[PDB]
Design a protein around this ligand. Structure first.
Ligand SMILES: O=C(Nc1cccc2ncccc12)c1cccnc1
Lengths: 269, 8
């Protein structure tokens, strides 16, 4: 009984509605997915057949983390309904960068660090997001915490090659553009380099396939040499030349990160 | 310069 357990508010985007849990007035986001549009299906520990997005969310939603957590889900005749956390006030990182332009490196460092920790969490839980981008990152403006959203393109993490992809093409790596093949972790690192450039320059570096495979990063904003080096390393054309998550977080540019509360008070409040 | 979202 979802119609009686939740009060449904207005649309948040698309089909996600704002909502409130009647049991305790908890703010939630209510996401509806049509069964006809689900291409990837999984099985729960109980054997129940659910969309892969439910499988992945359940795997990452235990304990605290930088992911919007799944609180509950329901099956309807023609759809699935997902009950998600809804922090407030929030702004997604795409709108944040649009409104504020290129971010100061101290702020980009704090944001990038939190995304790395969130992505490490997903990978530790066996989940590959496959659509890391500023549109899929929410900023809790009061707490200075970033939260990953939209696992609808994700997959179980594996060490073998992926040959399917439905994420955002301008964040996808050249091995996908060229050969329709990629490995999970090195593809994630590429999208993270795209995201870091986006933060410190105010928009993504590549729009066309030829730019993605070209291997040339032009900086349209003043960016420190240390930050440029990290970006260019993440955007190595050869996947095996890209850094691991450990090498990213040990990079000199990543040191002395702000705490979330410091980030909020200095840059968001 | 035009900045835009990109659908998945
Ligand atoms: O989790 C999602 N959305 C959200 C959850 C919670 C709060 C939000 N506040 C503001 C905007 C979106 C929000 C989402 C979006 C698109 C696709 N799949 C999932």
């Amino acid at each position: 009984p979802l119609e009686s357990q939740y009060q449904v508010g207005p649309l948040l985007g698309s089909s996600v509605y704002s909502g409130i849990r009647v049991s305790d007035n908890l703010p939630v986001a209510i996401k509806h997915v049509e069964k006809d549009r689900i291409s990837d299906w999984g099985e729960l520990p109980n054997g129940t057949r659910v969309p892969m997005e439910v499988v992945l969310l359940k795997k990452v939603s235990s304990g605290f983390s930088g992911v919007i957590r799944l609180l509950d889900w329901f099956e309807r005749p023609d759809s699935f309904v997902l009950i998600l956390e809804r922090p407030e006030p929030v702004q997604d990182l795409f709108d944040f960068i649009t409104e504020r332009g290129a971010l100061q490196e101290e702020l980009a460092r704090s944001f990038f660090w939190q995304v790395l920790e969130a992505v490490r969490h997903c990978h530790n839980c066996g989940v590959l997001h496959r659509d890391i981008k500023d549109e899929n990152i929410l900023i809790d403006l009061n707490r200075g915490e970033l939260k990953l959203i939209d696992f609808g393109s994700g997959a179980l993490l594996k060490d073998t090659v992926y040959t399917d992809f439905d994420g955002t093409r301008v964040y996808s790596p050249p091995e996908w553009i060229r050969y329709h093949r990629y490995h999970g972790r090195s593809a994630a690192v590429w999208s993270l380099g795209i995201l870091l450039y986006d933060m410190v320059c105010g928009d993504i570096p590549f729009e066309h396939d030829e730019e993605i495979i070209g291997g040339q990063v032009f900086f349209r904003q003043r960016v420190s040499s240390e930050c440029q080096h990290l970006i260019r390393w993440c955007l190595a054309l050869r996947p095996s030349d890209r850094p691991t998550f450990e090498e990213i977080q040990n990079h000199p540019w990543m040191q002395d990160v702000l705490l979330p509360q410091e980030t909020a008070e200095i840059h968001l409040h | 310069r035009k900045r835009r979202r990109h659908p998945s």
